[PDB]
């Protein structure tokens, strides 16, 4: 592994966490 063991393509926008 240089990245993650199985692929997980972005099929949805990123939704960061900004709250508790």
């Amino acid at each position: 592994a240089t990245g993650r063991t199985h692929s997980s393509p972005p099929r949805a926008p990123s939704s960061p966490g900004r709250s508790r």
Partner: antibody
Amino acid sequence: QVQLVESGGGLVKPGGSLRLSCVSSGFTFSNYWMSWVRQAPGGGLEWVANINQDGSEKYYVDSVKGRFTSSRDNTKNSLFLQLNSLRAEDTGIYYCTRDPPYFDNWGQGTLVTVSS
Amino acid sequence: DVVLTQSPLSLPVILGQPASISCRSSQSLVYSDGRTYLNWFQQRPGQSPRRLIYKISKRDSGVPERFSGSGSGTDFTLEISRVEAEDVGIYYCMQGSHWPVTFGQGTKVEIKR
């Protein structure tokens, strides 16, 4: 063999509605995300919409949010795109595609014209 | 969005010669899972795009071996070792590593005869 057969495109006034259809064969339709991609005339490809396997996740490019909704019917092998409040720039060939971001198989295209 | 810049925008080629398309990304193209989701498409007049290359360098099943993908970081390259007449048309690169999916503006390959 994977087939994506599209239909439903035509002439429609600014602000009108039109419903694109994609009927697939040759694969397990419910295993794939599907995706719509449009090509403005003499133009580049623009991604439009994603829809997950069962329809619970639907994402859209910004220029269309609130105006387009995708849908799918896995017992009918069918993928739809409901166009609404159409604008001059929604004109183009609309393509059904399989499995973003791989896009391994494409429908034959269906032309959408927005005109008075 | 990521901007993919293709060059040259129009590529005239003598039949039988090498031909090379560049794709310069305004961003690295490695998704959080470590993979680069970069594709090349060929489009012939009045036809839907045909996928030639996926994940930088993997060739799809239909595709002749004269087509090859390569590159890393922000430069990627499509490469037709031996150009044939059937290869006229428009070629697009396409990145999928960062939301949302973006295409290059397309390079037209024309035969010099």
